[PDB]
Write a protein that binds this ligand. Structure first.
Ligand SMILES: [Mg+2]
Ligand SMILES: [Mg+2]
Ligand SMILES: [Mg+2]
Ligand SMILES: [Mg+2]
Ligand SMILES: [Mg+2]
Ligand SMILES: [Mg+2]
Ligand SMILES: [Mg+2]
Ligand SMILES: [Mg+2]
Ligand SMILES: [Mg+2]
Ligand SMILES: [Mg+2]
Ligand SMILES: [Mg+2]
Ligand SMILES: [Mg+2]
Ligand SMILES: [Mg+2]
Ligand SMILES: [Mg+2]
Ligand SMILES: [Mg+2]
Ligand SMILES: [Mg+2]
Ligand SMILES: [Zn+2]
Lengths: 98, 70, 213, 53, 102
RNA sequence: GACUCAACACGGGGAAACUCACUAGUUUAAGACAAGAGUAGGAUUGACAGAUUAAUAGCUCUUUCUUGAUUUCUUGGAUGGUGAUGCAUGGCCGUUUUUAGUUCGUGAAUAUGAUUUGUCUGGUUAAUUCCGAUAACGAACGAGAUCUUAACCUGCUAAUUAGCGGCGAGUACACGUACUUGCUAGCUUCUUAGAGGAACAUUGUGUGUCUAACACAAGGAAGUUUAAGGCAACAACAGGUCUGUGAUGUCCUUAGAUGAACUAGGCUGCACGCGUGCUACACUGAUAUAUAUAACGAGUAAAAUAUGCUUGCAUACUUUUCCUCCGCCGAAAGGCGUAGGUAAUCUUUAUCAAUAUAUAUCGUGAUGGGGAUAGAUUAUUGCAAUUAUUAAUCUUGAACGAGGAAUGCCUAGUAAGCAUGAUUCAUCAGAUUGUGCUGACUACGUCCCUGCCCUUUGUACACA
């Protein structure tokens, strides 16, 4: 634990977020960068904000902001993208599809 | 409003000085006189974390352990 | 263990967010309303819409994402409490939201403003309405704003009956030159079930029966 | 070091905000509504409040 | 014995109907029941201003949210009473069945 | 920001930090994505100590350790902005106007037209509400109807977290009363809340075209639609709001930021003018003691508490936080310890107030009226009280003897007087929004003044 700067996302945190998104299908972020953690994920809320934001801008997820919340949803191009990133067999799929 | 006057020069950003092959100077071996440490090894970090030989103290960059000489 | 005052407020505020969240996901599919039934076993949410085919998706795939979204937002405490049901509107010619969403859709394609209002008026009166009214305001042609009113039939503005027998909706459309306001008021066929649950077919008319021959 | 958001904000105006806008002015707090007055008057009907006299 | 059924609802339209169904339904099973107890009605009040801006004659509107509550006591078994509740009670009246054992 | 009514205790705007947008400083990247550039013989992140800085911001230097592709860079680009534009818009609100107004079909004016009639001389009404007249005959909005609250019912339906009774046991006094305490036939006057009844000008006299309708009397709880509110028609204003909004169009800015923060100041600064108010000018009073007596409300991821390692990190996610009975301490303000309550169950309401009432002191004297401005001391709220947050005690003791020209609001449980719940709220009401207590004088009209409406008339006005 070498105490790096805040918002210096470790490679272990990014792998945790992708795995949550692939298994589950959707994620809700509740935009505010002062909350220390996500309900279902033990990562600083800011790290989740940046990664989905990057995912959104590459046309992998679409979202819309009801008052005080985020509501992201994955697409088909996202599914093929992550599987190569996370090295999974070609048969596993997100839950919301089955 | 009025545009402020800048008579005070810019404070420059701090960038890290670079030295080539830092670990190679840490250990040196002769034809005789095989592997031999030249610095101090930290106490509370994992083995292999050397600590700096400052002017009058020994300091570790990972745990900030400073052990005072003399 | 909160009190009744705090509990009633929490549920009313809960329904405000959910209705506003779905109108953004289901904007283009004729959204009309939601009724929430929170049972201790499992909580049910009923969706009313016009084009239910696109709402469910292929093999009900998108409703499962909606179920996963609602459950992580409002019911993060548990893991299985919610499902979502879809329903088709009985009479879509009298749903003010359905028409306002319909009129809005045309205006973003570039249809003539006068034809679209006439088209919506004719469909509404075809479905048995006793009266209707449409209003559009904004930058129509010039740089100065103006409002256009279209009426057909009979309408009421004052009193208690105006709240019961009249249906209302409001929407807005974002053009490249600004924002346009769409207002639809539909006067339902005069039934409008009453205080004592019963159809009040006649609001104020005092018709006299024909004496038996 | 880091001095971002280090002023204590446990009370006062900056402690809370509108549930809908994120605006910090004219917040209703009776019965824990936590909504600014402009937003509330729009959504007052669906919550359950009614006008009688 | 001595089981209590409590009803709360924002709606007077429905809560009297449900309170009628239980009283008639329990009478058929030939049960001794105590008639409805109508507790005092309470109202929640909010008085905000119109006019999101600042100008104009200062006008106000008075909002009210009123709550109702009933109370029925009877002598019977718990399991027959608790299944008597799930008789398609319309979902604006939430029912709390409480045993007043002492 | 707003500048007559329709700006000026208004922006729910009671700003110590935050809010905050203004002043002086210092940091951050929380610069998506694409291409490049850089580098695994290392792109970059972080820091003890001495200097340095308001600062314990490695902000930046001297010194050298750590980290590992997260960054860095470079050309496009993209969010964000309490930045400009309410004379580019949506939505909402205020005003003309709470007045009584607005339109259509067919016919007629027509024997060019803009247009007219229907929509009217007259009586009546809160009201184009009615009767009548009649080149017009019929319709629609608005008005009225409708909704909420209040007043009458010993007549219906019910009894807990409501009452009254009934059976004992007591403490006191009388030729049965007061209170305390256990148990618990029946009833609904008192309390709470569901459904119904009641008023229609009913009956007389009078006025009236005897029509539409008005006045007085009787009965009646109620006869100004019984009283108060809610909603609100065509159309308008270049009325206010982009500083409520992930509503939004253009323009500006985007790493030496108009983004996000952090530290200290300011929004309150005082020769003057204006608006809403509070306290007064005393005896129909001030001071002290004592007696009797209301209605609408509100209440429960962080920090803190129990126990150790040399305030840092473990352990309990326990009793903690909101209203607080009672006991003890303290002049007081407050402190300490423990009940009850997620509430017709407890705070607390067969009572949580002040005007009132009784007795005494003062005695027409800027006085015992009035309480500004100042000095010293104490306790709570908060990480922080200085420009004095708020409270408590002792001293000081200003103007003000009923107010010029002008000007506001009011016709009955109303004016005026008197208090109190709630909003904002860590701590601060001289404000707003409700609620109750005591309770007058004057009219039962008019077009003189000021406004708005209708008809006739004049116009060279039409931005009127
Ligand atoms: Mg408009
Ligand atoms: Mg009316
Ligand atoms: Mg104020
Ligand atoms: Mg203050
Ligand atoms: Mg903005
Ligand atoms: Mg304007
Ligand atoms: Mg406007
Ligand atoms: Mg005319
Ligand atoms: Mg009674
Ligand atoms: Mg706006
Ligand atoms: Mg500041
Ligand atoms: Mg000010
Ligand atoms: Mg005022
Ligand atoms: Mg005195
Ligand atoms: Mg004196
Ligand atoms: Mg006059
Ligand atoms: Zn808001």
């Amino acid at each position: 634990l070498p105490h790096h700067k805040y918002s210096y996302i470790p490679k272990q945190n990014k792998k945790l977020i992708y795995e949550y998104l692939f298994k589950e299908g959707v994620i809700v972020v509740e935009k505010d960068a002062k909350i220390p953690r996500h309900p279902h994920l033990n990562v600083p809320n800011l790290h989740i904000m940046m990664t989905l934001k990057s995912l959104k801008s590459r046309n992998y997820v679409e979202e819309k902001y009801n008052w005080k919340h985020q509501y992201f949803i994955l697409n088909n191009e996202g599914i093929e993208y992550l599987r190569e990133f996370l090295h999974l067999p070609p048969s596993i799929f997100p839950a919301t599809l089955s | 409003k009025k545009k402020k006057v800048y008579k005070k020069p810019k404070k420059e950003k701090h960038k890290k000085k670079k030295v080539k092959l830092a670990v190679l100077k840490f250990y040196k071996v002769g034809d005789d006189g095989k592997v031999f440490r030249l610095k101090r090894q930290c106490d509370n970090c994992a083995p292999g974390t050397l600590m700096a030989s400052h002017f009058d103290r020994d300091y570790c960059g990972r745990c900030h352990l400073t052990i005072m000489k003399k | 263990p909160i009190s009744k005052k705090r509990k009633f407020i929490n549920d009313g505020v809960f329904q405000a967010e959910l209705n506003e969240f779905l109108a953004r996901i289901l904007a283009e599919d004729g959204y009309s309303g939601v009724e929430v039934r929170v049972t201790p076993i499992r909580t049910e949410v009923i969706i009313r819409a016009t084009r239910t085919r696109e709402v469910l998706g292929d093999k009900g795939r998108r409703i499962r994402e909606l179920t996963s979204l609602v459950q992580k937002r409002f019911f993060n405490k548990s893991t299985n409490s919610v499902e979502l049901f879809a329903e088709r509107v009985e009479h879509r010619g009298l749903c003010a939201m359905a028409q306002a969403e319909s009129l809005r859709y045309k205006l973003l394609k570039g249809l003539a403003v006068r034809r679209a209002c006439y088209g919506v008026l004719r469909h509404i009166m075809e479905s048995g309405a006793k009266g209707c009214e449409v209003i559009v305001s904004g930058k129509l042609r010039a740089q100065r704003a103006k409002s256009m009113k279209f009426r057909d039939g009979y309408l009421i503005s004052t009193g208690e009956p105006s709240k019961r027998f009249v249906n209302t909706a409001t929407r807005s459309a974002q053009l490249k030159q600004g924002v346009l306001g769409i207002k639809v008021k539909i006067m339902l066929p005069t039934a409008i079930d009453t205080r004592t649950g019963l159809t009040s077919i006649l609001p104020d008319n005092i018709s006299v029966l024909e004496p038996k021959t | 070091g880091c001095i971002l958001n280090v002023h204590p904000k446990k009370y006062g105006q900056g402690s809370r905000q509108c549930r809908v806008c994120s605006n910090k002015h004219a917040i209703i707090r009776k019965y824990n509504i936590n909504i600014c007055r402009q937003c509330f008057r729009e959504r007052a009907d669906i919550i359950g409040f009614k006008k009688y006299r | 014995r001595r089981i209590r059924i409590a009803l709360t609802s924002k709606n007077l339209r429905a809560i009297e109907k449900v309170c009628s169904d239980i009283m008639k339904g329990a009478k058929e099973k030939n049960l001794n029941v105590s008639g409805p107890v109508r507790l005092p009605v309470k109202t929640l009040r909010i008085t905000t201003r119109k006019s999101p801006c600042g100008e104009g004659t200062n006008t106000w509107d008075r909002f009210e949210l009123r709550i109702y509550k009933r109370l029925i006591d009877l002598y019977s078994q718990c399991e027959v009473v608790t299944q008597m509740t799930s008789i398609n009670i319309d979902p604006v009246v939430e029912v709390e069945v409480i045993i007043t054992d002492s």
